[PDB]
Amino acid sequence: MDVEDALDKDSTKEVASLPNKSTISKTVSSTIPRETIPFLHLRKKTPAGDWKYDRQLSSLFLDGLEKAAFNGVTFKDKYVLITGAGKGSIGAEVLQGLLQGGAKVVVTTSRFSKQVTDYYQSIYAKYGAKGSTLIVVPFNQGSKQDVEALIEFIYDTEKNGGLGWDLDAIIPFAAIPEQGIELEHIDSKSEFAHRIMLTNILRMMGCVKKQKSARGIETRPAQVILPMSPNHGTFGGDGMYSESKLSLETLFNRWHSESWANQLTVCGAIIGWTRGTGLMSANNIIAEGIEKMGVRTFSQKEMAFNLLGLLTPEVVELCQKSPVMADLNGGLQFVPELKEFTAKLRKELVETSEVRKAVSIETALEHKVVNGNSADAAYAQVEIQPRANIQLDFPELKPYKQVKQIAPAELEGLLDLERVIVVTGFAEVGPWGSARTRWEMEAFGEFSLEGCVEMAWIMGFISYHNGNLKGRPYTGWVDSKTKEPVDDKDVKAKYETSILEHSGIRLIEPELFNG
Amino acid sequence: EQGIELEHIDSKSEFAHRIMLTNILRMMGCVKKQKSARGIETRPAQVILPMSPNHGTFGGDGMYSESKLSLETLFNRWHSESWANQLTVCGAIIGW
Amino acid sequence: TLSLIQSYSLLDKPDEAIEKVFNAYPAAREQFLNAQDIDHFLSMCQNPMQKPVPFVPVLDRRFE
Amino acid sequence: DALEQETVYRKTGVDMDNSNVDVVTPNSIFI
Amino acid sequence: DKNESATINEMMKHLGRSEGNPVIGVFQKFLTGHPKGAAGAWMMNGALQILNSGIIPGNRNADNVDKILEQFEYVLYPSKTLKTDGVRAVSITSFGFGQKGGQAIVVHPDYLYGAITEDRYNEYVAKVSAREKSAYKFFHNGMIY
Amino acid sequence: GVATSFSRKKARTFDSSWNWAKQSLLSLYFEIIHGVLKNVDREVVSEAINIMNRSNDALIKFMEYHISNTDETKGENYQLVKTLGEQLIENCKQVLDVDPVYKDVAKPTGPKTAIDKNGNITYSEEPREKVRKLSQYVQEMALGG
Amino acid sequence: ITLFVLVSVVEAFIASGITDPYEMYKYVHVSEVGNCSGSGMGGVSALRGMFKDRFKDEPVQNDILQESFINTMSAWVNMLLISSSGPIKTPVGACATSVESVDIGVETILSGKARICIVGGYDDFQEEGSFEFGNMKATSNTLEEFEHGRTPAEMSRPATTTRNGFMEAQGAGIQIIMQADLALKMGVPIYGIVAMAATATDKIGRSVPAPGKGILTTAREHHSSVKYASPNLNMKYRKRQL
Amino acid sequence: YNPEKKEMIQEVIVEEDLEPFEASKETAEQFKHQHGDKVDIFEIPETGEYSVKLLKGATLYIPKALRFDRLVAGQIPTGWNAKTYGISDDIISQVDPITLFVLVSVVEAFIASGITDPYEMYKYVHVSEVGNCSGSGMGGVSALRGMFKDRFKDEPVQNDILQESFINTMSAWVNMLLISSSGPIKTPVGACAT
């Protein structure tokens, strides 16, 4: 059967079939046709030393993934380090999953600020399951010292000002873009990125090993999810991207041959096409064209699932026997000369766009000349700019029958109204100005048109003018400094920025308190 | 690099890797620019890459394997970048 | 939003022109003049590129 | 006073977070 | 914050609040700071505006709630603004230096109008309408001049 | 590039899931009431999962009060939120003392590149053929092409 | 500090729809208008006059002492706007001033000594204040907050794990309270009902700024005999008795 | 305080460079941050103390003496001490003597009421029904001398001097030492008619 849901007609009955465990007798491993390679599959090392598709391993993998779609995956008692999980990343979508499964996660950021704090706050407030925790730390992958300190900061006891954890998973996804940098143009940027994308990751795997060997923890390996590329310099202009991503493949051999197999395991994730956000991030336009070669491209959420697939207790067991290479690429291996074919799909879209543009340009001009400025200047409408109608926010008084429903009827003529205290009028002067302005900031966190105007008027940025303004008689708002006319539309653009700096909780300005 | 496993990777390892990959690329970098300058499109220099087949089969070699495997990128970049007329790649898998 | 009076020719049926405006903005029926708009009304009475106003809007210096 | 008002009218006329470019993916570089 | 959470909880426990109806806590100081004197008055202003809107502003600065405060069943700590259908009564509690406890209870104003007649209410409405137009004029007048 | 950014003291922690459960339930509750989120939406599924994950005894008690004390008669929306509510209760009762779960219930979309009459390039993510649930995703991945 | 109050007072009467405060005397006798506003410190900038600026022999106005007084803010209100001869009860409640103010304001009207009362609180921020709040280690240690990577906007974080010290602020809040009966006759807006207002000491302590649980005595009721419902709660009962 | 001899200072300008004096590293740096260009500081190598060359154009305060004209006041008699009534030393040094006035006055009032142990009140009355509506016109005046003046002079002053400046805290100390009430507290200001 194809399992019937209640999704996009009545989501009261697919809220009803969420706890219900679905046991399926025919596994999707047997669904795999012979002579055909699935999109998602594991690979096995041959004695020759190359990575072929393996039927058996992939079967086990997809079965776990089938079970993830139905009953789901728990991440309870899984301690995870993750890097490069910025806003609108695969990292962030993986993070979402980990928290949803109740994992305890350290997230590493570069641009540590208020905006970024609030973002990860938003995520834990939406996805963070019971037993889940999230820690945000500012972090520089580039710095040796930061790596050594961070790993120490995780494993050091709470009593010495640490976390006292022991990691079960490491996702070192952090890296930087290299664009238009061929061999000759390799310089500072390239080497630094490579230091991030190989060396420090090794040192990070280095650091965790020592701290685990110290405490005699031989039986709790952390699973390192290596971001693999299949396109090892097929593209060019990527600088030292390929070199970094290929060098990681050494770990699949060093795991056998060195003494850290009991402290770490390697799970190489060959990542395929993932479409980013829903705008023209330069590559999303050609995605469609690529899928017409029998390729499949992924959403962020889909690729995340695939990577969260690598943390299922089945493939967890595999990592702890053999290195696991995960081909999570929708057959971009099998499209030949991938660079040339890419650029062709750009061309045929640009060409078709340009011709239909240049026709649209001339059919504007060859319509202009015919109609002069009589059917192309009388087509323009009249647009109205809003202006500040500040209301006093007096309480809405309902009709009498819409009051008698609320109070019980027995109350009529029961109370002495000379012994009832009623708030009649209220106001404040505060770091957020008037009661009105404060309320908008308190409740909404952004001023309305009425808000801005009032605040600007209070803060002496605008003042009203009636009479002779440079000869011409003027009525309206005026900038208090420049004596330039101002309209209510512009107030937001001109003043809000200046208002938010010099309003509310802020650094002490000595002018207001006599130096 | 002797007796340097994953955990013991430090200054020595990174510096050697800088020798055994980065600067060689920069060297291939340098020769390309100086040939493109003088408009010499028809006299490529043949780069003899010292290859290892034992990409971390041994261990304790630190960042030896990583360097020697990363060189294999040149076999793909020669096709896909604009330096094919100034250099050629001849990867030498050296035995005992 | 865009205007409801696109051209001034629509005023030639003035009763229906008034109703159209005050149906979209009912608040305007139940609220006194903003002092800003008062002054704007008086400034437009002094607009010289215009046949002078046939009423007395305000008692001031300019009453004469 | 009108002479004054006419006069004064004639003196006016590194991001290691993959937030910008998502280079964990092979496609984001430029391809 | 420990003490104030504790005392409200014990008030709600002793008076037999239905299990699973926490009071919702607004922390105005997060946005306004501590105007030590004027503390309660701003909280007063806030409470009133909450009643006449059915809007509950969350503590946006509350990244993470103290694990200690889990034990207080009958108290709720919002972060984002909660747009409700109505609010009936608001508790205001200020704690002063030198043992200065204070609690104010403020009740939705429409509860008053129940205790009078159709006639006096309809008389009241007409005069409040008369206030509102007159008030609007004077304010915007006094503002711009 | 290689400058130090990490310090111990800048570390923000987030652990108060117990508190977010009630809030996220309460937000959802009123969103249905004002007719922002309807029956048909995928939001009401995804949000439920997060609440079911964060199920403990207190969170049932909270849900039991606010649902059993609605009046169905006042609005069509109030009936709906009760029906959703009662069902949402029953699920959370089972998922208590059960490990929480990563389940993605997002609509599987494909890429569509549209070129209009004037040659403007538009990208939009569009529902595919035959793949409307991650059930049907895994099969598609296995069956190859 | 008074300037804060005056503006706050005017805007409150505007929020009450009372444009001319004399309008009150159409309905109410001069002796029935109270001002129960108060402060925790009051004329802080006047004290800088007295103790410091005099000592430096800088020119300071002779009557700076009268601006130091807490009640005189309320006086300037009555001296410029109100012209009342009604009661004036100016409370000190350093932090809980405004609540105490409301309690008194109510209690003035429940006697009938006033029918309308100006109520609320006010305090200023100055140099010596912040330093002494600093020395009591009560305010948020900004340098420590910068070490924790915090920004100004997020430095006041109530009920937080990482909460450490408050954020000192300046300003004024004013409310106007009336007899419901009078309010309904005047045709003024009604924002809500002041149900209960109370104050509460704590116990024997040896720490002044330590808050206590005293206010629980708003919720005192006896429970040995709670088997059967009390008719005193039933409005049905009370109505019939009237 | 001798009203014929009132300490006051004038802001003056240094015409010619002063002679160096000794001060701690911390102390010296505090001068340097104040005056900047108009002062120099140097490590004296042996001690580790710093020399302070205050330079031409620097700002100084020189004490002087106003001859004031109100020499008489109604004063609590000489030898009055909170010791003699029974108040302990730990309480005296911590607190503005304004409170000491109140405490004695409070005790003696309960004695005049025949209430020896204030707890006796709770035989008849619940904890929530005992109020303290005492008040002042200025309050912790001697604490303010702490805040505005004595701090400025970098004399040693107790950290919590601010709490003794508060008017309501006198009433608090009463409840904090004698009463243990949880009843109301309404502390009025009425400068003269308090």
UniProtKB/Swiss-Prot annotation, chain C:
Coiled coil: none annotated. Fatty acid synthetase catalyzes the formation of long-chain fatty acids from acetyl-CoA, malonyl-CoA and NADPH. The beta subunit contains domains for: [acyl-carrier-protein] acetyltransferase and malonyltransferase, S-acyl fatty acid synthase thioesterase, enoyl-[acyl-carrier-protein] reductase, and 3-hydroxypalmitoyl-[acyl-carrier-protein] dehydratase. Present with 91800 molecules/cell in log phase SD medium. Belongs to the fungal fatty acid synthetase subunit beta family. [Alpha(6)beta(6)] hexamers of two multifunctional subunits (alpha and beta). This is Fatty acid synthase subunit beta. It comes from Saccharomyces cerevisiae (strain ATCC 204508 / S288c) (Baker's yeast). The gene is FAS1.
From Swiss-Prot, chain D:
Induction: Expression is increased in absence of RPN14 and upon treatment with tunicamycin, an agent which causes accumulation of misfolded proteins in the endoplasmic reticulum. It comes from the Eukaryota. Coiled coil: none annotated. It is found in: Cytoplasm; Nucleus. Disruption phenotype: Decreases cell fitness. Causes severe growth defects and an overload of polyubiquitinated conjugates when associated with a RPT6 thermosensitive proteasome mutant. ATPase-dedicated chaperone that assists the formation of the RPT6-RPT3 ATPase pair, an early step in proteasome assembly. Plays a key role in maintaining homeostatic proteasome levels and adjusting proteasome assembly when demands increase, such as during proteasome stresses. Function overlaps with RPN14. Interacts with RPT6. Interacts with the 40S and 60S ribosomal subunits. Present with 2110 molecules/cell in log phase SD medium. This is Translation machinery-associated protein 17. It comes from Saccharomyces cerevisiae (strain ATCC 204508 / S288c).
UniProtKB/Swiss-Prot annotation, chain E:
4'-phosphopantetheine is transferred from CoA to a specific serine of the Acyl carrier domain by the C-terminal PPT domain. This modification is essential for activity because fatty acids are bound in thioester linkage to the sulfhydryl of the prosthetic group. The active site is at residue 34. It comes from the Eukaryota. Disulfide bonds: none annotated. Fatty acid synthetase catalyzes the formation of long-chain fatty acids from acetyl-CoA, malonyl-CoA and NADPH. The alpha subunit contains domains for: acyl carrier protein, 3-oxoacyl-[acyl-carrier-protein] reductase, and 3-oxoacyl-[acyl-carrier-protein] synthase. This subunit coordinates the binding of the six beta subunits to the enzyme complex. Present with 17000 molecules/cell in log phase SD medium. Belongs to the thiolase-like superfamily. Fungal fatty acid synthetase subunit alpha family. [Alpha(6)beta(6)] hexamers of two multifunctional subunits (alpha and beta). This is Fatty acid synthase subunit alpha. It comes from Saccharomyces cerevisiae (strain ATCC 204508 / S288c).
Swiss-Prot record, chain G:
The modification Phosphoserine is found at residue 230. 4'-phosphopantetheine is transferred from CoA to a specific serine of the Acyl carrier domain by the C-terminal PPT domain. This modification is essential for activity because fatty acids are bound in thioester linkage to the sulfhydryl of the prosthetic group. The active site is at 95 (for beta-ketoacyl synthase activity). Present with 17000 molecules/cell in log phase SD medium. Belongs to the thiolase-like superfamily. Fungal fatty acid synthetase subunit alpha family. Fatty acid synthetase catalyzes the formation of long-chain fatty acids from acetyl-CoA, malonyl-CoA and NADPH. The alpha subunit contains domains for: acyl carrier protein, 3-oxoacyl-[acyl-carrier-protein] reductase, and 3-oxoacyl-[acyl-carrier-protein] synthase. This subunit coordinates the binding of the six beta subunits to the enzyme complex. [Alpha(6)beta(6)] hexamers of two multifunctional subunits (alpha and beta). This is Fatty acid synthase subunit alpha. It comes from Saccharomyces cerevisiae (strain ATCC 204508 / S288c). The gene is FAS2. The chain holds residues 1211 to 1452 of 1887 of the full protein.
